[PDB]
Amino acid sequence: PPAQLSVHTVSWNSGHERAPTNLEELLGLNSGETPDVIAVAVQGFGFQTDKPQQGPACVKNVQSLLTSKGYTKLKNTITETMGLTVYCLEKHLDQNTLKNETIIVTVDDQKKSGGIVTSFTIYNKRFSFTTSRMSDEDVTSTNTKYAYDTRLDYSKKDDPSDFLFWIGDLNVRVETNATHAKSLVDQNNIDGLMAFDQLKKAKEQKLFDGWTEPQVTFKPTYKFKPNTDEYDLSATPSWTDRALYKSGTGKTIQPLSYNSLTNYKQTEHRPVLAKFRVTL
Ligand code: HEM
């Protein structure tokens, strides 16, 4: 049993955009790293029905690339608005302790808002990965617009997971006007602008309680003119895709890297890649 494992996560609010065919940068593999687990989350429109017939490319191109490196797909789950896939190096899996389970939670009668949780055990430690999606206009268990529900939080279980990650657009925004936000971006005052970000507000309301974000040094990932590095100032520049971590059992989780991937410019949000090292 190793002392430590590495975890890469990436999430993208990708909308109606197809998967890119260049996936190595997106998963954080392009400097030759071989992380122990990889989780990929999206938010957008149409995945499950898959009118665009994109599914096979996603499968063919990912299943392609990760299999050489010795990964196994534990689970892919899709809905009409969300997607979550988790992979683990084959070498770590004991099939009769793994207890591979996924739930889906739905908050509205159209099943457009809610979340997904995929959990599994290796070396007698339990991992849980969550993504979630909320609209600004819905009525919720929380009476907020933030993409939190206690049913997706495996730290609020009688038996909480050892390592927990929550990845996606949490519907947390920057609560100031665009002029001021754009001024702070141009000054590279990232912490100054973070002062207006809604995650702390969500936590004051006991949402995402005890969940930690790695330090943010990148500029807002939204809202861009597609194919440029130019903000569309019709919205206040915000941090949309986020990675949060927690342990339910006093285990150390150390972020290594937390970055937006500006080379993926196809849409209005830029994907966010986090790398962690966990101590079992
Ligand atoms: C219009 C947009 C998209 C549609 C309609 C769509 C549809 C799907 C469907 C139906 C699957 C599962 C099919 C199966 O299991 O046979 C899938 C898998 C997946 N897609 Fe997408 N996709 C879209 C965009 C994206 C984007 C932007 C990403 C970003 C990376 C992505 C990443 C994935 C991943 C990782 C899988 C799992 C691949 C595997 O089997 O290992 N997709 N896609």
Swiss-Prot record:
Subcellular location(s) of the protein: Secreted
List of residues binding heme: 58
Cofactor(s) listed in the protein's UniProt record: heme b
Tissue: Expressed in salivary glands.
An example Gene Ontology biological process: vasodilation
Changes after translation: The N-terminus is blocked.
Gene Ontology molecular-function annotations: heme binding; iron ion binding; phosphatidylinositol-4,5-bisphosphate 5-phosphatase activity
A GO CC term assigned to this protein in UniProt: extracellular space
Keywords noted in UniProt: Allergen, Heme, Iron, Metal-binding, Secreted, Signal, Transport, Vasoactive, Vasodilator
Keyword Calcium: no
Cofactor stoichiometry and binding remark: Binds 1 heme b (iron(II)-protoporphyrin IX) group per subunit.
Other remarks in the entry: Has some sequence similarity to inositol phosphatases, but no inositol trisphosphate phosphatase activity is detected.
Record's function text: Heme-based protein that delivers nitric oxide gas (NO) to the victim while feeding, resulting in vasodilation. In place of heme, the heme-binding cysteine can also reversibly bind NO when it is present in high concentrations.
Name of the protein described by the UniProt record: Nitrophorin Cim l NP
Organism: Cimex lectularius (Bed bug)
